[PDB]
From Swiss-Prot:
Motif GSGFP motif in this chain: 141-145
Protein's recorded name: Lysine-specific demethylase 5A
Residue ranges of every copy of the JmjC domain listed in the record: 154-291
Binding residue positions for 2-oxoglutarate: Y131, S194, N196, K204
Function statement: Histone demethylase that specifically demethylates 'Lys-4' of histone H3, thereby playing a central role in histone code. Does not demethylate histone H3 'Lys-9', H3 'Lys-27', H3 'Lys-36', H3 'Lys-79' or H4 'Lys-20'. Demethylates trimethylated and dimethylated but not monomethylated H3 'Lys-4'. Regulates specific gene transcription through DNA-binding on 5'-CCGCCC-3' motif. May stimulate transcription mediated by nuclear receptors. Involved in transcriptional regulation of Hox proteins during cell differentiation. May participate in transcriptional repression of cytokines such as CXCL12.
Family of this protein: Belongs to the JARID1 histone demethylase family.
The record's note on its domains: The GSGFP motif is required for the interaction with SUZ12. The ARID domain specifically binds to the CCGCCC motif and is required for the lysine-specific histone demethylase activity. The PHD-type 3 zinc finger is required for the interaction with histone H3 di- and trimethylated at 'Lys-4'.
Reported disease: A chromosomal aberration involving KDM5A has been found in M5 type acute myeloid leukemia. Translocation t(11;12)(p15;p13) with NUP98. Chromosomal aberrations involving KDM5A have been found in M7 type childhood acute myeloid leukemia. Translocation t(11;12)(p15;p13) with NUP98.
Top-rank lineage group of the source organism: Eukaryota
Length: 291
């Protein structure tokens, strides 16, 4: 009954010539990545943007996440508190190392993935984590340099800088993750693309569904969702659309997975449902774009 990992989504390692334009590159890999919903892009080895957030002033109040909140269906549990980037990392590393009884970097990604989905549906164990998930790049700056040192100028002007993506048909948002912090199944507003960059930290685990199976996923969601949420509009239902990928796979929905490591991009395609969780303390940046 252990979690069965979905097949891996495509991973592209473009050369420096192919890495010249994101929209041109995504358009060329489209015939394959469109059929998997998500794909991972590894930039060339020497493409390393320096972290450009104001780490000194970085303070945030993460949301509280109870992993088994849906299964517990059949409000003063924990208030939201303020962290700094360093104090949140100390809390995140202490939680994971105490939970697995080993150094955080020695915990296999398959074990965290297996334990996360066990905790989501567990009724005896109540695990509660925190996620810095409502942080705009206007708050303390983007993780990318934005027009800086001369060595940073190439990255401030790069097309893969998420601040330089075409967003007209917003600004990038930031995610400070810890172990077991997660985001449930959803598509973007206007069925837009989304591009996600992990600046540093432990990997972010993804699950994606191709757009041609979008209506099949919504059917399975509606059938198995709690009856009180079944009639809710999609924008509100998407706030609690947590579902084990094996359940979707058992109902014929194709699901692909990947572990997004530091310095790697993840692109979601139009109407491609996606979800995931963080393996540990990390820092991500994401923005929607249209083609
Ligand atoms: O956490 C990731 O890395 C990640 C990757 C891809 N898509 C999403 C979508 C979210 C999403 O954030 C809500 C808020 N933000 C978006 C809307 C504007 C404000 C900022 C979320 C957070 C936690 C639980 C559920 C969800 Cl849906 N997080 C994503
Ligand atoms: Mn998203």
């Amino acid at each position: 009954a252990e979690f069965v990992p979905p097949p891996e989504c495509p991973v592209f390692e473009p050369s420096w010539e192919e890495f010249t334009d994101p929209l041109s590159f995504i358009g060329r890999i489209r015939p394959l990545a469109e059929k998997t919903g998500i794909c991972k892009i590894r930039p060339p080895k020497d493409w390393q943007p320096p972290f450009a957030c104001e780490v000194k002033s970085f303070r945030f109040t993460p949301r509280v996440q109870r992993l088994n909140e849906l299964e517990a269906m059949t409000g003063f549990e924990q208030a939201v508190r303020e962290y700094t980037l360093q104090s949140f990392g100390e809390m995140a590393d202490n939680f994971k190392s105490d939970y697995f009884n080993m150094p955080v970097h020695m915990v296999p990604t398959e074990l965290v993935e297996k334990e996360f989905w066990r905790l989501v549906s567990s009724i005896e164990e109540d695990v509660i984590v925190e996620y810095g998930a409502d942080i705009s790049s206007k708050d303390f700056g983007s993780g990318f340099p934005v027009k800086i040192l001369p060595e940073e100028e190439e990255y401030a002007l790069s097309g893969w800088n998420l601040n330089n993506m075409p967003v007209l048909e917003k600004v990038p948002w930031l995610y400070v993750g810890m172990c077991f912090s997660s985001f449930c199944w959803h598509i973007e507003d206007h069925w837009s693309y989304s591009i996600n960059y992990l600046h540093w930290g432990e990997p972010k685990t993804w699950y994606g569904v191709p757009s041609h199976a979008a209506e099949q996923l919504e059917e399975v969601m509606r059938e198995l969702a709690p009856e009180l949420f079944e009639s809710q509009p999609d924008l509100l239902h998407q706030l609690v659309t947590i579902m084990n990928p094996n359940v979707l796979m058992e109902h014929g929905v194709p699901v692909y997975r990947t572990n997004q490591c530091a310095g790697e991009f993840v692109v979601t395609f139009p109407r491609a449902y996606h979800s995931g969780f963080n393996q540990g303390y990390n820092f991500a940046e994401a923005v929607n774009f249209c083609t």
